[PDB]
Design a protein around this ligand. Structure first.
Ligand SMILES: NCCc1c[nH]c2ccc(O)cc12
Ligand SMILES: NCCc1c[nH]c2ccc(O)cc12
Ligand SMILES: NCCc1c[nH]c2ccc(O)cc12
Ligand SMILES: NC(=[NH2+])NCCC[C@H](N)C(=O)O
Ligand SMILES: NC(=[NH2+])NCCC[C@H](N)C(=O)O
Ligand SMILES: NC(=[NH2+])NCCC[C@H](N)C(=O)O
Ligand SMILES: [Cl-]
Ligand SMILES: [Cl-]
Ligand SMILES: [Zn+2]
Ligand SMILES: [Zn+2]
Lengths: 25, 20, 28, 20, 25, 20, 28, 28, 25, 20, 20, 20
């Protein structure tokens, strides 16, 4: 269960070197 | 993203999808 | 740059709160 | 963002330039 | 919804350069 | 603080209030 | 001092847990 | 090493997600 | 109430210099 | 650990137990 | 606190001096 | 882990060597 800033933290573990988009809606 | 990983459960492998 | 990588961790947390329902884009 | 914001302390206006 | 350490993280984004008090009760 | 921002919803603009 | 600013982020998280219902004061 | 201590904070967060129900061991 | 990564953060405040094991199950 | 500190409430003093 | 605690690793006693 | 991973950026394989 990955919600709020924890979802962003998880996105960063995986993609932080490549970069990513976060678009909740 | 929120459905995939907050509503349903997610994998770090599945989140590679969202890397730009 | 390790200390930038650590720093990036903090920035995305900050963008998360700063941006709201709009979301954000992160890119080194 | 890294260049601008891991160098000097950025401000909440520097940061808001990376909202979608 | 900003509770526990997330409220403190949010307080810090805004005030971390000025300083602040956190007094939950 | 907790009522303003955890019980009710909050703004980063509203939290400027608590900066010392 | 960026690395102190990053460091401050960690300290307030630590004071949050350390202090309990008492709360804390943070000041550079 | 302060910056390693800060760095350690980030590593355990990363191991938490990386490892799952297995858990992990942290040791300087 | 210390769950998920917050429990790990709390484990780290106390033990981060010594080291620790985290074994949820 | 999870019962002690997530299910029941915990102390930072009690978590010294788990330091290796 | 920054002076004392972002310089050397502080201890949980250094930190507790900033509780209210 | 500190030696390997606070020096260079580690990868999710370096990290997974510290799972139980
Ligand atoms: N005004 C400081 C906002 C802020 C919070 N965390 C940060 C991290 C890096 C940075 O450049 C800036 C920040
Ligand atoms: N005994 C280490 C406690 C601790 C946790 N995080 C910290 C950050 C800075 C510091 O000086 C100390 C700490
Ligand atoms: N591939 C980067 C994963 C990662 C996330 N956080 C980290 C902190 C330190 C490190 O060496 C590596 C990481
Ligand atoms: N570093 C992380 N992303 N940790 C995940 C923690 C899970 C947390 N209970 C949540 O609401 O998602
Ligand atoms: N960096 C932050 N303050 N994030 C806010 C995350 C919201 C979280 N679900 C909470 O309980 O408040
Ligand atoms: N830095 C920390 N460990 N903070 C504890 C925050 C409590 C959080 N609501 C939880 O699910 O546990
Ligand atoms: Cl939470
Ligand atoms: Cl850091
Ligand atoms: Zn949380
Ligand atoms: Zn950090």
């Amino acid at each position: 269960h990955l919600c709020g800033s924890h979802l962003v933290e998880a996105l960063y573990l995986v993609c932080g070197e490549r970069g990513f988009f976060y678009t909740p809606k | 993203i929120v459905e995939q990983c907050c509503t349903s459960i997610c994998s770090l492998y599945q989140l590679e999808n969202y890397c730009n």
